Amino acid sequence: MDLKVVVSLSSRLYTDEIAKMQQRIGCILPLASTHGTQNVQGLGLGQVYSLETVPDYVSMYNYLSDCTLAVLDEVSVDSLILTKIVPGQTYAIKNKYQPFFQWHGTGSLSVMPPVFGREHATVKLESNDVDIVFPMVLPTPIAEEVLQKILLFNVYSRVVMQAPGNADMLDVHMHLGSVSYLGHHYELALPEVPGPLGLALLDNLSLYFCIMVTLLPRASMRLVRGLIRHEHHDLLNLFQEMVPDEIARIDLDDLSVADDLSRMRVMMTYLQSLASLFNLGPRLATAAYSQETLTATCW
Amino acid sequence: KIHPGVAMTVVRTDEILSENILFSSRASTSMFIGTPNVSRREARVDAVTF
Amino acid sequence: LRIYYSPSIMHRYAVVQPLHIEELTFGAVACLGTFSATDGWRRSAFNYRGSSLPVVEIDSFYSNVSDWEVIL
Structure with a gap:
């Protein structure tokens, strides 16, 4: 009815990072608890994704479905205003994401952890010493393909650990790390050691x-x-x-x-x-899209 | 109970319950108060949250 | 579901029953609908003809039936 989210910062954010958060305006992120008031620690995908830890994309991709999803509305030094996504409401959404894959009604939008890069998707907040990991959203077949690439590289890594090196390694990383679209190539960041829960999915x-x-x-x-x-x-x-x-x-x-x-x-x-x-993954169906405004009407 | 080659020190931490006194001088903080809002959301089949 | 039924899968798959082509299917799952989280499970007695049974009660349920999915 009146989905309203305001998240309070304990200390004022620096004059640099207020501009970076303004650059992140109009973006989906998952939040912890369905409340009008939230602490910044629950906000965003920061806490489970650590720079120190080896990234488990399956753990992230499990965690994001557990969270309710939201859209950023107003960036200030004191608080962040976000609206929330109910399953049965229709929302105006704008594609401001930096890779920029063209969207069509053919696919439902799917939300993934930032498989591409680590640093650029995230914003650090040293004023309140926490990190905001924005999720990456993508259409359906690219998302299916990237999940396939991740699981296949998990399998071939676990195989190739006691196999010959240079030949099998330099053959595997050809066209698995890199996804090639019209006019472009992009490098997936893949984990060095797959140990939790991806192998469980492959066992299943x-x-x-x-x-x-x-x-x-x-x-x-x-x-x-x-x-x-x-x-x-x-x-x-x-x-x-x-x-x-x-x-x-x-x-x-x-x-x-x-x-x-x-x-x-x-x-x-x-x-x-x-x-x-x-x-x-949470799938959001697309019913209308305007390329000139980069604006879809999701469901 | 033979002494080993080394001696040793021990470090502990403790917690003490304290009923405290707070003093504040007159007129130290200016406060801005706004109009309160009441909103409704997420009606259950038998309930509504405000 | 799989790690729940793992001991029963072990026992039923055991030696009593070897195989046949229809016998491979094991379980079926269907969703009955969404229930308010954090409300919980209200335990009550059911009294009929002078006998009692423990029954859980679910408040504010929303009904949404799904299809059947095979699990094994």
Whole structure:
């Protein structure tokens, strides 16, 4: 009805950092408690993301969904005025973020920890000795891709720790650290040692992998072998005239329709659960956007 | 109970409950008071928060 | 949910039941709706025909049913 957030600073902020916080005007950040008055320690994503600690993006990306989300409205030396996001209210939002990926109605906006860089997304407050980590918001497919890049680099790092170095290292960091868009390349900051909770997510996915690997339909494998032998598509670009060895020995049995029907049914029940697993983030649907004003009308 | 090669010192901290006296001279702080606001929000199906 | 049902998953998966294709599915989850946080769980007796059962009571509930998701 009247979502109103005012956050009180204990001491006045310096004459430099008031300008930097004015540069951050109009931006989503998650806050701790749903109250009109908040202390600055609860505000922002500062407390869980430490410069001293190895960054766990999965821990951040869990933490942000737990917080209710908000939008900055007024920056003063004494207090910060923010409005809050209720699930069933429609808001005017302006894209002021420094990477600037073009937004469209096609994707729901997704909010992520600042995977790209550390320092530039954050503002230090030595007047009240706390740090504000603004989240980074992105459209849907880039967010899905970056989460995929992070988990794949987690897996290949844990593999490559006792593998050969220079060849496997200099092959992996090609087009995994860097995401390439129209006219641009950008370097993801990836953790050096993945230890908490990313591997737990990968374990959860491997559970579904081990269950699904038994119930695969055979005729689709036959169709893939016949297609890669006879014809070519961009779907078939990865397979040349060579066929991988596994598929023939899974293939050797004949086709019975009811078995593939049951396998398709069980896999059909499972993929919806996987679709539940992949999200892990607050998704805000976009219904209107003006490029000339960089202004969307979110939901 | 044989003495080791070294001696040792101990450091402790303690907390004492104190009923305190505050003195303040006349007219030391000027205060600005504003109109109070009352707002409503986030109506539950059986409740409303103010 | 998974680390909750892990002992039951262990026991049921155990030796009593080996496998068959339909038997792989284990659990189902559906959401009933949103409840006011920090309100908590109000424990009360239920008296019928001279017998009592402990019952939790939920205030100010909001109803929103979701679909079924398979868990294993």
